[PDB]
Write a protein that binds this ligand. Structure first.
Ligand code: NA
Lengths: 255, 255
């Protein structure tokens, strides 16, 4: 009975022309969708415009990162209070691109998670193992560590309403890809890990697949029982492709 | 002969309500000002809104930071192309809060400067020495090093149309204060340093004072020949206190 969520991570892509075109096309392609929740995370300067463009549709807003302070003398930072104020709900934290390029630690990401919960925002907690970690047979240990930074400091209750996105980092720019069976094995492990602390919370947590998802492979991934949607990368930038993914999630999970 | 510039760095302060109120009040308080340029840098998510509220005023927009990529798979980053697209003109880079809290190196800041120049945006390059550096008599050495990261890698023409903001970190909220004579000595040094590579570029660079400016010292600071305005922190959150600084800059250079 978990209602799927398909979220578009636009990454560093956007312009006022593009926001209008893409959100308008998304509204049209998604106007008949009932069985899947949808969120988009444009670059921070476009959240307000995208929110305005999405008014009248069921498309929810989000953001790609957040910092730790709500206000103060912190030049260039992003406030959870302001993200809430501007209309963002689903906030991506711990994306592999930020863990790598910006050295964001497990502990820092758990702190972001806490700030978001205090604001009534929905963290989209990204976790996943690297190529070296995967080769060492560490997939489970790494996912557990990343989840534990939150679970062991804030309890299972912190995952009520939250979203986890599993990114097999080892499949990024390596030519490789995870199969739906491989993806499912990891999602079931993540859910079982949380279940060790609170089985009820585990059953309600939305676990999205964050590896490569496109119009072609969405159906096979969403047929898996512990895959509750996707955090979509490149396919998020074209309304037609993104819509096929949303409809595939709808079809896979509907009664 | 340099037209002064007073810029408000809002830091991590802003909301929908505060943007509407502050921008409206600023336009009212700045009525009749023509001899001093004015820019504001709200948190990134509010730049678009602030620009719209600024319509009908002479207030120019800006931002508090930028990253190095224009587009791509860089979740949570800020693109200079998008800042330009959203209407931000004056982009603060290398602020002491980012050099310290986010460990931004001289080299990284110089790369930000380059991306801004490539896009045709105006960098507001912040430089300045710490408490210890000041006590050790290293003010000039530090300022030269921070400027050289750009000057020696990009050439003196990089500073055509650019802004430099000198922040006396050693004196900002520390119990010690910089006199106008002391600020003037640093500004003159900065301009002389650039002049060693290109005298014509040096004479057109806008060098703002970034230390504590209030109504009581604005007149004496702005009477100094090498001080072309100020990068204002806390006072930029109150229309009346910010306008007093702008009017002092106008009055001083029209004296
Ligand atoms: Na930022």
């Amino acid at each position: 009975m978990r209602h799927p969520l398909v979220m578009g991570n636009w990454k560093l892509n956007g312009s006022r022309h593009m926001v209008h075109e893409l959100v308008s096309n998304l509204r049209k392609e998604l106007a008949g969708v009932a069985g899947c929740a949808v969120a988009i995370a444009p670059p921070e300067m476009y959240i307000d415009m995208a929110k305005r463009e999405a008014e009248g549709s069921h498309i929810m807003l989000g953001a790609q990162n957040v910092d730790l302070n709500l206000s103060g003398a912190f030049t260039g930072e992003t406030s959870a209070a302001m993200l809430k104020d501007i209309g963002a709900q689903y906030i991506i934290i711990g994306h592999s691109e930020r863990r790598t390029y910006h050295k964001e630690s497990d502990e820092l990401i758990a702190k972001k998670f806490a700030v978001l919960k205090e604001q009534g925002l929905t963290p989209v907690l990204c976790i996943g193992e690297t190529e070296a970690e995967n080769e060492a047979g560490k997939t489970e240990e790494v996912c557990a560590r990343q989840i534990d930074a939150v679970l062991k400091t804030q309890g299972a209750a912190a995952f009520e309403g939250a979203v986890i996105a599993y990114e097999p980092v080892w499949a990024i720019g390596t030519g490789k890809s995870a199969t739906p069976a491989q993806a499912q094995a990891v999602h079931k492990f993540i859910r079982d890990h949380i279940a060790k602390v609170d089985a009820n919370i585990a059953e309600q947590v939305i676990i999205q697949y964050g590896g490569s998802v496109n119009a072609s492979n969405a159906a096979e991934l969403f047929a898996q029982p512990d895959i509750d949607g996707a955090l979509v990368g490149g396919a998020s930038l074209k309304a037609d492709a993104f819509a096929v993914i949303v409809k595939a999630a709808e079809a896979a999970k509907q009664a």
